[PDB]
């Protein structure tokens, strides 16, 4: 039975425990403030906690200050006793969705506190007050939440219903803007034979997403490109026929279905390309490439490729400059040979090409931050030795 140990969520880094003490010092019983500066780099977890010696003053500070702006951002102060159990249970923030984009946790809290004290209330209230029209609202427990479900599912609130029946993903104010009856990501079927007509784009396709609009796409050249736009019902059926009707047979020919003009509600195509670039971006070399910094300016890809011609099959010689002007030190030759790159670790590391030495290391923007971590380490170390020096120097 804790007196008070209270959740304070949706913070901003200006709010210190000095400012929380300045807020909650006329409440009456200030015990402590656990600011959740998580131990990566003192970052908030999205929240913090305030502990009070008084249970009543804690209940007071909740019911007075729930989405009130502490230093300009609304305070999401709730209960979190069952919240580590919601962490190691998976439960917690349920999807009372289609919320209002102009109503925050305070107004809807005081509205549906007749449905209960919302122990995990959030709307999409980022951006210093703007809700996107949904969020993760969840009450005390299953009974009060189910009372709110069976009591209010589809009612009116400033001309908007809610949806907790399905786990509705984001963009819900603009859900009907996505559902507008004109725009839709079609399906380009590539290399179509001329036998397929507007009738034929509706025959086997209306089951995989209903079709009224079926357009045999001729181009501005008179012919067919071989690419025809299949106009299903929803972008999920664009998903269903890009990854189910891929090189399929409509009658006898291919269905290479790509996504004609993606509307961004299904996404992440070729983002693995990103991770394919993670084969060669920060883990740069794969023991192949050479980040050779500190050439001469006369050393272009000309003289870099000239030096690395004995060092294997040159595949990418490339020096970034001030908009193809001033390089500030660095080039790259992606090889095709790892052992000639080891020969360069011998030779072309610690190498004058023209007059100024080559500098060889694997190329990453990753551990710049780890180097800054080491800078923090050495900074606190010299602070410590200076503290000992000024202490014992008398």
């Amino acid at each position: 039975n804790s007196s008070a140990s209270l959740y304070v969520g949706d913070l901003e880094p200006s709010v210190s425990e000095a400012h929380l003490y300045d807020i909650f010092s006329p409440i009456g019983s200030v015990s402590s403030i656990r600011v959740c500066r998580d131990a990566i780099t003192k970052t908030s977890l999205g929240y913090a906690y305030v502990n009070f010696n008084d249970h009543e003053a804690g209940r007071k500070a909740i019911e007075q200050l729930n989405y009130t702006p502490i230093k300009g951002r609304l305070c999401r102060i709730m209960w979190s006793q069952r919240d580590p159990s919601l962490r190691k249970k998976g439960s917690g923030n349920i999807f009372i969705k289609n919320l209002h984009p102009d109503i925050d946790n305070k107004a809807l809290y005081d509205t549906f506190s007749v449905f209960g004290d919302i122990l995990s209330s959030k709307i999409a209230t980022d951006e210093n007050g703007k809700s996107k029209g949904f969020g993760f609202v969840h009450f005390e427990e299953e009974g009060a939440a189910k009372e709110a479900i069976d009591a209010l599912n589809g009612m009116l609130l400033n001309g908007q219903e809610i949806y907790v029946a399905p786990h509705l993903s984001r963009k819900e104010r603009d859900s009907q803007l996505e559902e507008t009856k004109a725009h839709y990501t079609n399906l380009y079927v590539k290399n179509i034979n001329s036998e397929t007509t507007d009738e034929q784009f509706q025959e086997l396709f209306a089951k995989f997403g209903p079709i009224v609009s079926a357009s045999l796409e001729k181009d501005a050249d008179g012919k067919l490109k071989g690419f025809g736009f299949v106009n299903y019902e929803k972008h999920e059926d664009a998903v269903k026929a890009v990854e189910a009707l891929n090189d399929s047979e409509l009658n006898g020919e291919k269905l290479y279905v790509g996504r004609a003009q993606k509307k961004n509600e299904r996404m992440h195509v070729l983002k693995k390309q990103y991770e394919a670039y993670r084969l060669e971006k920060m883990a740069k070399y794969q023991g192949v490439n050479l980040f050779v910094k500190n050439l001469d300016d006369s050393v272009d890809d000309e003289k870099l490729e000239e030096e690395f011609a004995p060092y294997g099959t040159i595949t990418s010689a490339k020096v970034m400059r001030t908009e193809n002007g001033k390089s500030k030190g660095f080039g790259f030759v992606c090889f095709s040979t790892p052992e000639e790159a080891t020969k360069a670790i011998t030779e072309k590391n610690q190498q004058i090409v023209a007059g100024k030495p080559l500098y060889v290391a694997i190329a990453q923007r990753k551990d710049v931050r780890r180097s800054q971590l080491a800078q923090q380490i050495q900074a606190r170390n010299q602070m410590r030795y200076q503290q000992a020096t000024a202490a014992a120097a008398a």
Partner: protein, 172 residues
């Protein structure tokens, strides 16, 4: 580095471990050697039995491209014998500038690059056993078997050595 039985230096790689260079500093001894920032200082004697001949030159070598840097000659100080540069030590913060000191103590704060810039601090006292350094750059430690130190420099600090973090500082 391998300062060897006959005043010579076999220098090797701890990593590749192929022999690359058998430099020959002296013929008899190698006594005072330091390796700092690809620069090498050594003085040992080179004369066998009637010698008194700790070599009157600072033999200077580099790790850069296997070259004998021009050996700075070491004077005989004030005495009439040989030079005797048996204590040659590069500075900690200045890993090319060194201090050279004899058996009696004719020590000199001396550049590597310009041997003209010598600071020939004489020793108006007894000959030495050993001497040590100053990471704070301003501490002479002459030490014999007498346990009586003295620093000669200008009085930049009231401090002795470098740092001030003792785990039982004045009170266990």
């Amino acid at each position: 580095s391998i300062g060897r039985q006959t005043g010579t230096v076999d220098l090797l790689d701890p990593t590749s471990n192929r022999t690359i260079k058998s430099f020959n500093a002296h013929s008899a001894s190698i006594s005072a050697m330091d390796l700092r920032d690809n620069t090498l200082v050594t003085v040992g004697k080179s004369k066998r039995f009637y010698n008194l001949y700790a070599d009157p030159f600072v033999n200077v070598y580099d790790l850069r491209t296997m070259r004998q840097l021009p050996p700075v000659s070491f004077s005989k100080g004030t005495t009439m014998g040989s030079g005797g540069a048996d204590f040659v030590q590069l500075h900690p913060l200045l890993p090319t500038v060194m201090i050279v000191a004899s058996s009696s103590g004719s020590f000199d704060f001396i550049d590597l690059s310009n041997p003209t810039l010598r600071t020939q601090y004489v020793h108006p006292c007894q000959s030495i056993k050993k001497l040590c350094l100053s990471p704070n750059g301003d501490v002479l430690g002459i030490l014999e078997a007498d346990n009586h130190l003295d620093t000669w420099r200008r009085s930049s600090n009231n401090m002795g050595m470098f740092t001030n973090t003792p785990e039982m500082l004045a009170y266990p």
